Design a protein around this ligand. Structure first.
Ligand code: NA
Length: 293
């Protein structure tokens, strides 16, 4: 009900969201990153496949001036293109639209959400993981002041291989339920753009404790045409749906980089202790339920 949605009290949560957005955007600007504006419709987007976290659905699509456009799954390809433009360090507050099923309505997913999405030329996985640890520690100390509650105190998070998480816990979420500090999961076989080297994937997810689940994901990247297109073909994806990106790769303009996206609503939910992510959204976007507003 529309009247019901707008009769919720959410002012304290949005006051916290404002403090989080100010803190994070200020951090990246002061670190020397360029602040880019988002892409919403494009011929190319993140396939989100293969990916253990994904259902592999098609993006929303619309015809624009007679040409098929995809609503942004994520800006990953565009981040790589920004690095190809010589911009070195970039971030964006990026809307993502992912039409996941009701099976992903588990309290941490929304079908429309925002990532603070960033990328750094020539960075390695340890560089990005340490940068996120520095950001998160400082944020959690401020959150203690804002809320009057205690937050996790560790500064270097434990690291698990994805294969070990499957063996010990069964899933990323079961691991989250059993942990009291944030932790990393690394080496996850997934999309063509994440860098793979002789069976090892140079990638990482940050997982929150107390069952709150994933909050950030990233990797080092592939930049070579021959490697990228081999991965696309092996996965059975449509090469033509990546054509301009592949033209740029073939021309040699992609560079080595690494980065991550941080789910803003997920982070707000953690800091305020909300059971469901819909509680932190003025206009909920619940997987499998088309919003009335
Ligand atoms: Na290989």
């Amino acid at each position: 009900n529309a009247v019901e949605i707008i009769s919720r009290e959410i002012s304290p949560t949005l006051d916290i969201q404002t403090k989080i957005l100010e803190y994070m955007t200020d951090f990246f600007v002061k670190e020397g990153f360029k602040w880019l504006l988002p892409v919403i419709i494009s011929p190319i987007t993140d396939p989100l496949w293969p990916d253990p976290a994904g259902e592999g659905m098609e993006p929303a699509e619309v015809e624009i001036y007679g040409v098929k456009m995809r609503l942004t799954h994520s800006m990953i390809l565009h981040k790589q293109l920004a690095i190809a433009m010589g911009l070195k360090k970039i971030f964006v507050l990026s809307p993502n639209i992912r039409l996941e099923s009701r099976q992903k309505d588990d309290g941490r997913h929304a079908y429309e959400f925002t990532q603070l999405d960033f990328e750094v030329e020539r960075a390695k996985m340890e560089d990005i993981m340490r940068l996120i640890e520095r950001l998160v520690y400082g944020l959690f100390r401020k959150a203690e002041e804002w809320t009057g509650r205690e937050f996790p105190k560790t500064k270097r998070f434990e690291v698990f291989e994805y294969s070990e998480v499957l063996e010990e816990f069964g899933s990323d979420e079961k691991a989250s339920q059993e942990m009291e500090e944030p932790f990393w999961i690394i080496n996850i076989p997934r999309e063509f753009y994440d860098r793979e080297v002789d069976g090892f994937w140079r990638n990482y997810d940050l997982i929150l404790p107390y069952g709150y689940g994933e909050v950030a994901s990233g990797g080092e990247r592939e930049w070579e045409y021959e490697k990228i297109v081999a991965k696309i073909r092996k996965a059975g994806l449509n090469e033509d749906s990546f054509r301009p990106y592949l033209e740029i790769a073939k021309a040699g303009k992609l560079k080595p980089s690494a980065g991550a996206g941080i789910g803003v609503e997920r982070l707000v939910r953690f800091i305020v202790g909300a059971k469901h992510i819909a509680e932190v959204q003025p206009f909920p976007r619940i997987p499998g339920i088309p919003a009335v507003i």
